[PDB]
Amino acid sequence: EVQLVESGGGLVQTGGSLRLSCAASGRTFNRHYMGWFRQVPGKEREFVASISQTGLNKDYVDSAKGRFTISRDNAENTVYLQMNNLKPEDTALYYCAGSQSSYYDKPRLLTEYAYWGQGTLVTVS
Amino acid sequence: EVQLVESGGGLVQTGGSLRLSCAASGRTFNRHYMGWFRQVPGKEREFVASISQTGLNKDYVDSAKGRFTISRDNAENTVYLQMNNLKPEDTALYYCAGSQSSYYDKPRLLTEYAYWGQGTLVTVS
Amino acid sequence: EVQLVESGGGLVQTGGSLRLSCAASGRTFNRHYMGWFRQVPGKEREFVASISQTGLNKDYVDSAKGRFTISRDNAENTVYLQMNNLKPEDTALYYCAGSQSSYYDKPRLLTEYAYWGQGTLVTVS
Amino acid sequence: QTDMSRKAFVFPKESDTSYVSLKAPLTKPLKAFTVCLHFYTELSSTRGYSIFSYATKRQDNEILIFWSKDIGYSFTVGGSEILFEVPEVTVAPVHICTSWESASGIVEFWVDGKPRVRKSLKKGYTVGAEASIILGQEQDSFGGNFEGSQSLVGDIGNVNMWDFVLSPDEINTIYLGGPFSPNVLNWRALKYEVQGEVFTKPQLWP
Amino acid sequence: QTDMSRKAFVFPKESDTSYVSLKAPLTKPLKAFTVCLHFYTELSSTRGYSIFSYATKRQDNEILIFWSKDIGYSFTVGGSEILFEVPEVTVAPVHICTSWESASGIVEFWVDGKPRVRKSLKKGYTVGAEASIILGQEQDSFGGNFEGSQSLVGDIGNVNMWDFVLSPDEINTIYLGGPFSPNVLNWRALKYEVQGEVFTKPQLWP
């Protein structure tokens, strides 16, 4: 039921860093797991990362692991994705998605997710 | 009729700088000539400077001549006093005051000034 | 989480008194211990004193004991620092800080403190 | 010594002169102890007050248990303080046993028999023996400076203090009224000096 | 071995280095287990903490019992998590028994001898035996990297862990304190190593 918004996108030279943020409108945010997905023109959205409702358990994709970090602030009910090691290819649209009103694990699919944000653009020069 | 509130006071090293300001509440501000007065504990107030409505004719005390500057703004209806190369002796409370329901020159006496502010402390070490 | 403001500063002749006050914005004020620190140009802040949450245990610096008093009013959540027999050296900026949402003794360091006010200026002529 | 059994002191009116002075035969300094007592008052929904005041010559607040308004039980040793918060205040006689040990800094706090979580205080400190113990006044000096806003109106009894930490079993026995042997302060052999408006009456609490 | 009966550990200060390391004789990987333990702390209303940490060289969170703020009990196995919400919390010693089966993926959650609904988690998995078990800290690595915001303050005892699912009757007997023979971790034959501010004291809970 939450409404997702994203910020922190833009253009940066290779090797830079970006602390993208996502805000949630609702009161059940602490009962839904969050995730970051990637989208490119002429293609569909792709899994990037997923993070614990409790926040103690996370999941990174093979490319993102070691380079990206995902965290959440329940009190501020906002998710943070620190993207670093920025190479040209990782320039596309990014979506903060999330959908879960019940205890469960962290999946890596798209059907389960039910709510999506407007999105943001990230570019590497 | 206008209410004068100064600001920008504080503590600074010898030979410093300080752009004190003064806000005036009212609509006749462009009709009065403003002034800055000095006062020390155990003594009366002393003249410091005087600023004009049109702002083209001013008057500086002998010591402050060249070292200090006084200016006025009409759109924002405020007054600015800039002091540079401060010393220990010039450390007291400064009052942006004045009163002009008339159209005259800039005097150096205290009686003519009717409206007075609260004052701010300026100290140099 | 409280927001600290201070008042009562100014300039006074030696041997005078000053009842500086500090106000707190928040509801957990009674859960935080309070403290007064000193700062001078060309140097860092300096411990001055402290006040117990419950308001039964205090701590003064060696110079402040016998000359300064510290108290807190929980109902109005305000901290009072009464100084007397002021000396010329006792002219600098003063900060009311405090940060132990929890329960512990009174320390005399700076790292533990987390929240700071804008500050006030005190001068002795 | 006078047997205080089944009897309690009464402080009927708020004032700054009614107080009781206790005398301790203590000689060696204390590394540990256990205070147990039973008190009753309705001031909770009002200003703060001092339950037990121990003061050496070099520190008015060597040990002071104190109720802080809206906060709860405030225990302090050697100038430090920790608070045992209380959410809501009832209106009934209450029994409290508190222990502190200098070796580990562990403090135990048992209210009406139900223990509070252990916490730390002043590890390595030592308490002097020569002291003044007072009932009904918080002393900011060795033997005076009693403030009116801090005096206790109500009743106190069963005051007892050891020189070592009792086990949980022993505390349970005390709260149930079983036999025991105080070694630094015995209610049954107590020695005191009353001052002002304080009286001796049968205890209200069971 | 040491008999810890009627005794418990104490963590008096919120700190990052205080923790106890447990050792197990287990060699075969676990297809099922049950864990029972008693613990008492007051951090519930302030922040989250880790009760029990089982980790292996390939996974820092093989088995994690964690209290999340404003959520309740969060049970994690093999990198997957479930929540057992708690509406309201109270200040009392709490005993908990938690079981999981690999064959069916069923999980039982008993708090104060009251069972939570059985749920599913990671059917078909295997738990490696080689592992480090730690109390007082949540461990994000096999030998380090702890977090002060997550360490626990208070007491934890009666830690017992089996390699199969007890029936409800046996759990009831555990709750009331009867005789039982743990096979992997024995409170009565425990081996351990302590680090930092941690102590051994008589238990508070009955």
Curated annotation (Swiss-Prot), chains D, E:
> Between which residues do disulfide bridges form?
36-97
Q: Which residues bind Ca(2+) 1?
A: 60-61, 138-140
Note from the entry: This protein owes its name to its ability precipitate pneumococcal C-polysaccharide in the presence of calcium.
**How many cofactors are bound and how?**
Binds 2 calcium ions per subunit.
Family, as annotated: Belongs to the pentraxin family.
Q: Give the Pyrrolidone carboxylic acid positions (modified residues).
A: 1
Where, in this chain's numbering, is Ca(2+) 2 bound?
Answer: 138, 140, 150
Swiss-Prot/TrEMBL keywords: Acute phase, Calcium, Disulfide bond, Metal-binding, Pyrrolidone carboxylic acid, Secreted, Signal
Tissue spec. comment: Found in plasma.
Q: What does this protein do?
A: Displays several functions associated with host defense: it promotes agglutination, bacterial capsular swelling, phagocytosis and complement fixation through its calcium-dependent binding to phosphorylcholine. Can interact with DNA and histones and may scavenge nuclear material released from damaged circulating cells.
Name of the protein in question: C-reactive protein
Assembly: Homopentamer. Pentraxin (or pentaxin) have a discoid arrangement of 5 non-covalently bound subunits. Interacts with FCN1; may regulate monocyte activation by FCN1.
Q: Name one GO cellular component term.
A: extracellular space
| Pentraxin (PTX) domain: residues covered | 5-206
| Gene3D superfamilies recorded | 2.60.120.200
What molecular functions are annotated in GO for this chain? calcium ion binding; choline binding; complement component C1q complex binding; identical protein binding; low-density lipoprotein particle binding; low-density lipoprotein particle receptor binding
Q: Supply the induction statement.
A: The concentration of CRP in plasma increases greatly during acute phase response to tissue injury, infection or other inflammatory stimuli. It is induced by IL1/interleukin-1 and IL6/interleukin-6.
Task: Tell me the InterPro entries matching this sequence.
Answer: ConA-like_dom_sf, Pentaxin_CS, Pentraxin-related, Pentraxin_domain
In terms of Pfam families, this protein maps to: Pentaxin
Q: Which gene encodes it?
A: CRP
Cofactor entry = Ca(2+)
Per the record, the GO terms for biological process are: acute-phase response; defense response to Gram-positive bacterium; inflammatory response; innate immune response; negative regulation of lipid storage; negative regulation of macrophage derived foam cell differentiation; negative regulation of mononuclear cell proliferation; opsonization
Subcellular location as annotated: Secreted
